[PDB]
Amino acid sequence: KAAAPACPRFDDPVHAAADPRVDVERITPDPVWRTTCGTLYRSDSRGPAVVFEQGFLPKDVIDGQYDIESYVLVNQPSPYVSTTYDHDLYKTWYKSGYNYYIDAPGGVDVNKTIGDRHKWADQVEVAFPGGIRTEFVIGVCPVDKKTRTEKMSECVGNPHYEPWH
Ligand SMILES: NC(=O)C1=CN([C@@H]2O[C@H](COP(=O)(O)OP(=O)(O)OC[C@H]3O[C@@H](n4cnc5c(N)ncnc54)[C@H](O)[C@@H]3O)[C@@H](O)[C@H]2O)C=CC1
């Protein structure tokens, strides 16, 4: 047995951003940044050919919804790409198609930022302002709609993944 080490700390809180035009000063409320470095996950209907090329780009870093709770409660175009601590959250999506695996520094820990009492605290979300570059996307597993399970013989690793810890 070995105990795990601690995580590297990047000076830039949006070091992972695919779109660095994100304005961290406009995040509300004041963000509590994730300091751990475990695998995160994201349900996305887009195929790996798309995501592995572009990374996870946010829908509107300029004029989007910068308020976390507003974005959590009412999904609308925002500077954030949503991820979860929960490997199994894909089972709650309607035909989300893929469960992406992410190894990225930072992100805003939603429940630490807005509390764990809101309606969707159960999503244990980490919101990445500016999105996530492809080098931090590990890979993906397709989801079988009927059983809400991963098709594990069809998982694919991202050739652009660059381990950093
Ligand atoms: N998706 C997840 O695994 C998680 C989502 N959430 C919550 O769910 C809601 C967000 O769910 P999402 O489906 O992530 O909304 P989202 O708008 O990020 O993605 C919705 C769909 O839009 C498309 N899409 C996303 N970004 C795009 C882009 N840059 N260009 C083109 N098409 C794009 C994809 O088909 C994606 O499945 C928020 O309220 C958030 O709190 C929280 C935890 C993780």
Side-chain angles (χ1 to χ4, degrees), residues 13 32-36 38-42 68 71-72 80-86 89 102 104-113 120-121 123-129 131-132:
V32 180
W33 298 100
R34 160 176 165 274
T35 65
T36 55
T39 305
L40 305 172
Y41 311 86
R42 174 175 166 80
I68 298 293
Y71 167 69
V72 168
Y80 307 111
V81 172
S82 288
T83 70
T84 179
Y85 291 109
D86 184 358
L89 195 70
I102 294 162
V108 180
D109 189 307
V110 170
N111 289 356
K112 291 181 184 301
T113 300
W120 297 109
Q123 295 182 313
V124 291
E125 186 182 344
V126 179
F128 280 85
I132 305 166

Side-chain angles (χ1 to χ4, degrees), residues 92-93 96-115:
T92 68
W93 253 258
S96 168
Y98 301 94
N99 194 33
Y100 284 87
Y101 291 48
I102 294 162
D103 179 16
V108 180
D109 189 307
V110 170
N111 289 356
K112 291 181 184 301
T113 300
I114 66 171

Side-chain angles (χ1 to χ4, degrees), residues 43-52 54-93 96-116:
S43 286
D44 202 298
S45 61
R46 287 174 298 168
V50 180
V51 171
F52 292 176
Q54 306 164 9
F56 285 114
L57 283 167
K59 285 190 169 169
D60 185 354
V61 290
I62 303 310
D63 301 314
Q65 179 55 262
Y66 268 80
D67 183 68
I68 298 293
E69 189 164 10
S70 291
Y71 167 69
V72 168
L73 192 69
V74 179
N75 195 20
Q76 51 179 139
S78 84
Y80 307 111
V81 172
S82 288
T83 70
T84 179
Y85 291 109
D86 184 358
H87 172 273
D88 297 327
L89 195 70
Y90 73 90
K91 296 178 178 288
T92 68
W93 253 258
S96 168
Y98 301 94
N99 194 33
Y100 284 87
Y101 291 48
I102 294 162
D103 179 16
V108 180
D109 189 307
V110 170
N111 289 356
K112 291 181 184 301
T113 300
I114 66 171
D116 62 359

